[PDB]
Design a protein around this nucleic acid. Structure first.
Length: 120
RNA sequence: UGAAUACGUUCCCGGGCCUUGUACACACCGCCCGUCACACCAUGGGAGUGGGCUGCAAAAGAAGUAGGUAGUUUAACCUUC
């Protein structure tokens, strides 16, 4: 397909050096992305600081690169045959359903709940 | 065969430099404080008790000395003895 994000996705899917097994899986279930990714990409995430003497979950922006990377990770981790689990997720991911979308949600939820720490 | 991730240095651990405080120098796993317990010693208080010394107020009154004297007695002087 000749796309660096696709390269990433398989390497994020790849296990134990096995690029072929991965590459097949992704390529086959793709036969059955750029959208379904963009509906998992999180804009906001909580981090954590030693604030002085406690641990507070502080909202921060996700930068666009980590945005695509966190999405891929979430798809794969939810998704985890595999091609009969990697289109399964990565279609519900275009239909704002599943667990990769639940991530985007439950992350934004946590950030929304921590807006009181946004900039301090 | 063949990744992911590193914003960053707050945090944890180990280490380096400068500075500062220190009652530390076996060097913080340092030093060190008081009670209570135990041993011992000296010391204060204490119903008191027994000794030493001593103040004051009296009693007492040996010897001596001085004063006064009925009484007693008496070589040196005097004498009508």
């Amino acid at each position: 397909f000749k796309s660096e994000l696709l390269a990433k996705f398989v390497n994020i899917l790849m296990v134990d050096g096995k690029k072929s097994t991965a590459e097949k899986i992704v390529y086959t279930a793709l036969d059955a992305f750029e959208e379904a990714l963009e509906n998992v990409r999180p804009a906001v995430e909580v981090k954590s600081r030693r604030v002085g003497g406690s641990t507070y979950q502080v909202p921060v922006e996700v930068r666009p690169v980590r945005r695509n990377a966190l999405a891929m990770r979430w798809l794969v981790e939810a998704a985890r045959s595999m091609a009969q689990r990697l289109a399964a997720e990565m279609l519900d991911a275009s239909e704002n359903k599943g667990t990769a979308v639940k991530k985007r949600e439950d992350v934004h939820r946590m950030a929304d709940a921590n807006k009181a720490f946004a900039h301090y």
